[PDB]
Amino acid sequence: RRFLCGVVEGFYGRPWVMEQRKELFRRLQKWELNTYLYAPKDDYKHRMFWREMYSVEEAEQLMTLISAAREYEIEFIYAISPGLDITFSNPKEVSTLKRKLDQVSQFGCRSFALLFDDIDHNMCAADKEVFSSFAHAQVSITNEIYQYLGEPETFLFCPTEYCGTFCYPNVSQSPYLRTVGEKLLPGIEVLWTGPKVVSKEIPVESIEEVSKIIKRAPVIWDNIHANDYDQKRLFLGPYKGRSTELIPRLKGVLTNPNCEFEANYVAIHTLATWYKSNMNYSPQMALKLALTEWLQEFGDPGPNEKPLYTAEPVTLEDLQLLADLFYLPYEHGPKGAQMLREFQWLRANSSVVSSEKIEEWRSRAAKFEEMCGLVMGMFTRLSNCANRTILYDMYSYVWDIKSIMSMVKSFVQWLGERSHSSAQFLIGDQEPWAFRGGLAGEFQRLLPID
Amino acid sequence: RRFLCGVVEGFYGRPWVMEQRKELFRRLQKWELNTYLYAPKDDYKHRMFWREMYSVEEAEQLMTLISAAREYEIEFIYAISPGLDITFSNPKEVSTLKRKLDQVSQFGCRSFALLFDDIDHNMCAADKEVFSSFAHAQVSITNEIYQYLGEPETFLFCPTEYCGTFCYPNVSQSPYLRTVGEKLLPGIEVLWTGPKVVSKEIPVESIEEVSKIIKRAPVIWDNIHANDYDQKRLFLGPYKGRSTELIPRLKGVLTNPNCEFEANYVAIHTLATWYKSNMNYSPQMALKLALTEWLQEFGDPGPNEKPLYTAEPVTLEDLQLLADLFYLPYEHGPKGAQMLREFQWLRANSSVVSSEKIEEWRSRAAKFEEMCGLVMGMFTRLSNCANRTILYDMYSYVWDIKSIMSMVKSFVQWLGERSHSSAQFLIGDQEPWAFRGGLAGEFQRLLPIDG
Ligand SMILES: CC(=O)Nc1nc(F)c(CN2CC[C@H](OCc3noc(C)n3)C[C@@H]2C)s1
Ligand SMILES: CC(=O)Nc1nc(F)c(CN2CC[C@H](OCc3noc(C)n3)C[C@@H]2C)s1
């Protein structure tokens, strides 16, 4: 029983580089995962200019990339997205699509995908005269490509209605999916993101629902750890909301993770744990394993001689804290959720300190300040660690939380000194606001803060 | 007369990748520049763990990188920074340094550099017993490496006192530089950043000053476009503050630019213009050329057939505006300087609208709101162009300017409404503050903005 488990590079944003992808293939193999779907939205020749051939430089890179996948026994799948401006009814458009995939096939690629995600449902007049519907047009060209490429063992199709919320009028009664299930050649796989684009949970019943109308078990394109929809978000939490009971009901799972390559250790490690779990998986136990394994990636003179360069090393606790601060799309981690609650409470109840309630406030304030210090401890230790590669992939996120938290600790301390002081708390007096660089900082200082 | 002109990848931050460096070599050649100094502070084996050999994977990458430099006729210079924890007096430390540079030499590298920048001046007791000073220790090992590597044609030394402000007690009377000038082998080049780490201007007289004590013309390591000292600063302005009169008084210029690769088009293009200027250079003319050339990097069906994908293209004006907002360390660009002045004025004179003065306020407010709209327009055209990745390098900056700017436009609109509406202006009510994502955003919303 073949099962596609791995990664889809299918986000908007800076595509990953050779060095990173080769590293991804090493990791997938060691974690017994087997698939890689090549689909960067911002490779201008994958989507926007799907018609254009790859240059000689681009060709050498793709050959190298495909050889690296083969070397680590990872199935490389080349995806193409022609849906933005293709005229399905034009024979010249069909041979251009064939020309493009023959080029990539000449680079050693054996598996392919046709994606029709995030495109206008409205066809041109020429296509309307040839196909009963949009689904007819897509299936027609997808079947033609699949057969033209000699019916590859691994060939995927991504529908325009790729999740529950995108199905018109719904999953069970979609005429688009109806056509897909009936006319799409049986050997072609169908990609699905679950109930939503970013699914909190993928319930077994929803997979049975879609499998009936598409007439096959789908391959999940999972957006649980994707973050290209918010420049200020990062998901270091475990694979969650997908029962192992989905495994016999699926043809595979391809995770579409965070843009920042090094942040995808937990995302991919926990998915591998889930896949090999023997129908018994715990997100908390999986997160602990991933964090423990991740920590490894973070790592002589005389008395009158110069001491060797040394830094206070990153701890498991620092990583537990970090993952809890940058957790999942629908939940913060325990430690982050707790800190937020503590801050909300202290701010809401600051009036008691402006008897047992005063004791409660001071006790919770002291515990919060320690929590704040631990975030600073984490920042400092990460910023002085051996692995600069891991650090600079997340630095902005960590720096940002560290900065906001020091203003929060200051404010909580100010609220405490209120009984002994009439001094005012000003955001303008805080270093992140006052010492903010660039032209933007000059403008920001002139805004009416306080 | 050999003259080293090019780039030094010598900052703190994420090092550039293979794809980027190969592109840098293509650009340097086409712009008739010739040198690349490899010195990323955060390549863990360049500085922090200078002793450790490169792995097999690291080795293949360095070989590929060095072959790419040769392919585009760029001199590749490998730098090593052992100064944080080296015991100069230890023979084992000296052979480790030799072992490390023999490894990189085996990858095809012919040129080398020893850097002693940003290190504690205080030597260990073992070193004090062997060398009269810190300068003695450095020169000793630098001369040993240079000769051990068979005296390479291109060999550089970066002093601990690499700029005017870092010289104790001053440039002309530095005992450290005195030792450097006297004992450093003549064939070795000395790197210098001018009067400061980030020099506003490099005056000819300052180069004469330093050349006397170091007893040679230096190679400028220029930090004009560097941005690792501030997470919120970016420099797209032209090469400025360095007369072409410096060229015959220097062994070269190596620019240390912004951490974000695609943001170094102007920085490197204008330096090439300056280098080939034939003693007549204009920063404004150079900036215009660079911007015009950079615009190129941003770029049939029937009537009943589907129209080809098309995007509203990025304009020269958008680039002029972008460069003006992220200009130079000591100056904003005209358009950015103007916008700031307009905002300062409007805020300072808001009381008139709380007769000809009211007309002035309303007129300047309207012009400012258009200026604000042009910034959003620029942001939008850049995020929807053919080459999205250029903006992916600069996103944090463009997003931040766009965001503050929208809040500033709101504030200016609120100020002009104070005569009619009684509504209060709240930062918390503004979209960049209110719709801020992540856990950090949740905490930020709970901060006492507006008291
Ligand atoms: C088949 C399939 O899943 N195709 C995809 N293509 C890309 F580029 C994806 C990544 N990003 C793109 C931006 C999307 O922002 C809109 C959004 N939808 O909900 C939320 C939350 N944001 C989120 C989405 C997760 S997922
Ligand atoms: C010989 C020579 O010039 N060597 C250099 N090494 C690095 F890494 C440079 C780049 N950066 C390093 C950081 C410097 O920040 C100092 C600073 N000032 O306030 C704060 C905060 N940091 C500025 C300087 C421009 S220049």
The CA distances from residue B244 to A23, B3, B195, B351, in Å, are 46, 13, 17, 49
Breaks in chain A (C–N > 2.5 Å) following residue: 299, 354
Topology of the domain covering A316-419: Methane Monooxygenase Hydroxylase; Chain G, domain 1 (1.20.58)
DSSP state of B110: -
The C-alpha atoms of residue B144 and residue B216 are separated, in whole angstroms, by 20
Q: Does B420 lie at the interface with A, CB-CB under 8 angstroms? A: no
CA distance B408 to B402: 10
Active-site positions of B?
A: 118
Bridge partner list, B222: B255
Task: Report helix angle A316-325 to A283-296, nearest 10.
Answer: 120
Q: Which residues of chain A lie closer than 8 angstroms to B308, CB-CB?
A: 85
Q: What is the CATH number of domain A4-281?
A: 3.20.20.80
Tell me the CA distances in angstroms from A186 to A114, A180, A211, A216, A341, one per residue in order: 15, 10, 13, 8, 52
CATH code matching the domain that covers B4-279, chosen among 3.20.20.70, 3.40.228.10, 3.40.50.720, 3.20.20.80: 3.20.20.80
Report which of B29, B300, B335, B319 is spatially closest to residue A85, judged by C-alpha positions. Answer: B300
| Backbone φ, ψ for residue A38 (5° rounding) | -80, 105
Residue B218 · residue B211 · CB < 8 Å: yes
Query: What SS3 class is residue B41?
Result: coil
Strands (E), B84-138: 111-115
**Please, which residues have CB within 8 angstroms of residue B89's CB and are 6 or more apart in sequence?**
B126, B127, B129, B130, B131, B137
Looking at all shown ligands, the one closest to residue B12's CA atom is: 2
DSSP B272-339: HHHHTSTT---HHHHHHHHHHHHHHTT----TTSPPPP--PPPPHHHHHHHHHHS-BTTB--HHHHHH
Residue minimizing CA distance to atom 14 of ligand 1: A229
CA angle B296, B311, B395 (to 5 degrees): 70
**B 161-190 residues inside an 8 A Cβ radius of A:** none
What's the first-to-final CA gap in chain A, in angstroms?
A: 64
Relative to beta strand A219-222, strand A189-192 is: parallel
* Of A399, A395, A383, A393, nearest in space to A262 by CA: A393
DSSP B429-447: GSHHHHT--HHHHHHHHTS
Beta B35-38 vs A252-255: how paired, if at all? unpaired
The secondary structure of residue A123, as a DSSP letter, is P
Pairing state between β A252-255 and A4-9? parallel
B156 closest CA partner among B254, B291, B14, B262 = B254
How many CB atoms are located within 10 Å of the residue A267 CB? Answer: 23
- The secondary structure of residue A328, as a DSSP letter, is B
Q: E-assigned strands of A311-368?
A: none
φ, ψ for residue A219, nearest 5 deg:
-105, 120
Cα A18 to Cα B17: distance, rounded to the nearest angstrom: 9
C-alpha distances (whole Å) from B363 to each of A97, A184, A342, A407, B346 are 55, 63, 49, 39, 10
Cβ-defined contact of A86 to B306 (cutoff 8 Å): yes
Q: Characterise B118 by phi-psi region: left (phi > 0), alpha (psi -120 to 50), beta (else).
A: left
**B376 in contact with chain A, both atoms CB, cutoff 8 A:** no
Q: What is the CA radius of gyration of chain B?
A: 26
How far is the C-alpha of A6 from the C-alpha of A9, rounded, in Å? 10
DSSP category for residue A304 = T
Task: State which ligand 2 atom lies nearest to the alpha carbon of B41.
Answer: 8
- The helix (run of H) or strand (run of E) holding residue B31 is none
Atom 10 of ligand 1, nearest CA residue: A11
- Cα angle at A183 between A177 and A188, to 5 degrees? 85
Sequence ranges of the domains in chain A: 4-281, 316-419
Which residues make Cβ contacts (< 8 Å) with residue A61, sequence separation at least 6?
Answer: A18, B19
Phi-psi region of B376 (alpha: psi -120 to 50; beta: other; left: phi over 0): alpha
Find, among B102, B17, B337, the residue nearest to A19 by Cα: B17
Q: What are the backbone angles phi and psi of residue B47, rounded to the nearest 5°?
A: -130, -80
The structure was resolved experimentally with X-ray
Feature table: binding site of B: 10, 41, 117-118, 162, 228, 256
Residue B309 contacts A where some CB pair is shorter than 8 Å: yes
State the Cα–Cα distance between residues A390 and A7, nearest whole angstrom: 19
Q: Which residue has the tokens 């007289």?
A: B205
What is the spatial distance between Cα A385 and Cα A311, in angstroms, rounded to a whole number?
A: 7
A369 in Cβ contact with A409 (< 8 Å)? yes
Strand partners, A78: A38, A112
Neighbours of B407 (CB within 10 A): 19
Residue A255 has what DSSP assignment? Answer: E
What is the C-alpha separation between B42 and B139, in angstroms, rounded? Answer: 25
- How far is B13 from B230, CA to CA, in rounded Å? 11
Residues of A taking part in catalysis: 118
Q: Are A80 and A100 in contact (CB under 8 A)?
A: yes
Q: How many CB atoms lie within 10 A of CB B348?
A: 9
A153 within 8 A of A111, measured Cβ to Cβ: yes
Taking the C-alpha atoms of residue B197 and residue B261, their distance in angstroms, rounded to an integer, is 21
Q: What secondary structure letter does DSSP report for A161? A: S
Question: Beta strands of A34-93 (E only): which ranges?
Answer: 35-38, 75-80
Sequence-separated (6 or more) residues with CB below 8 Å from residue A67: A108
Half-sphere exposure of B321 (CA within 13 A, CB side): 21
Any atom of ligand 2 within 6 Å of the Cβ of B136: no
Distance CA A429, CA B372 (A): 27
Backbone gaps in chain B, preceding residues (C–N over 2.5 A): 299, 354
Distance CA B59, CA B107 (A): 7
Count of helix runs (H) and strand runs (E) in chain B: 15, 8
Q: Which of A244, A248, A242, A245 is nearest to A221 (CA)?
A: A242
Interface of A with B in 379-418 (CB under 8 A): 386-388, 392-393, 396-397, 399-401, 404-405, 407-408, 411
Residue with tokens 């423990």: A292
What residues contact B186, with CB distance under 8 A and at least 6 apart?
Answer: B216
Q: What is the 3-state secondary structure (H, E, C) of B141-180?
A: HHHHHHHHCCCCCCEEEECCCCCHHHCCCCCCCCHHHHHH
Contact B36, B75 (CB under 8 A): yes
Residues 6+ apart with CB under 8 A from A66: A76, A107, A108, A109
CA–CA distance, A251 with B198 (Å, rounded to integer): 58
| DSSP bridge partners of A9 | A38
Amino acid at site B227: N
Instruction: Kindly report the nearest CA distance between residue A210 and chain B, in angstroms.
Output: 30
Q: Is A228 annotated as contributing to ligand binding?
A: yes
Would you give the distance in Å from CA B272 to the centre of its chain?
15
Cα B233 from Cα B394, distance rounded (Å): 10
Q: How far is CA B243 from CA A283, A370, B8, B236, B271, in A?
A: 62, 54, 20, 19, 11
Angle of CA points B210, B132, B100, to nearest 5°: 80
Instruction: Name the maximum alpha-carbon separation found in chain B.
Output: 88
* Structure-block tokens of residue A341: 């609650």
- Quickly list DSSP for A208-224: HHHHHHHTS--EEEE-T
E-strand stretches of A358-419: none
C-alpha distance from B4 to closest chain A C-alpha (Å): 28
The answer to whether the peptide bond before residue A307 is cis (omega within 30 degrees of 0) is no
DSSP B214-241: HTS--EEEE-TT--TT-TT----SPP-S
CB A218 within 8 A of CB A248: no
Chain centre to alpha carbon of residue B415: 38
Task: Name which of B330, B224, B234 is nearest B270 in CA terms.
Answer: B224
Instruction: Using alpha carbons, list the distances in angstroms from residue B290 to A169, B12, B267, B319, B326.
Output: 53, 26, 9, 10, 15
Q: What single-letter DSSP state applies at residue B374?
A: H
Q: Which amino acid is at B214?
A: I
Cβ-based contacts of B347 with chain A (< 8 Å): 446
ω before B169 within 30° of 0 (cis)?
yes
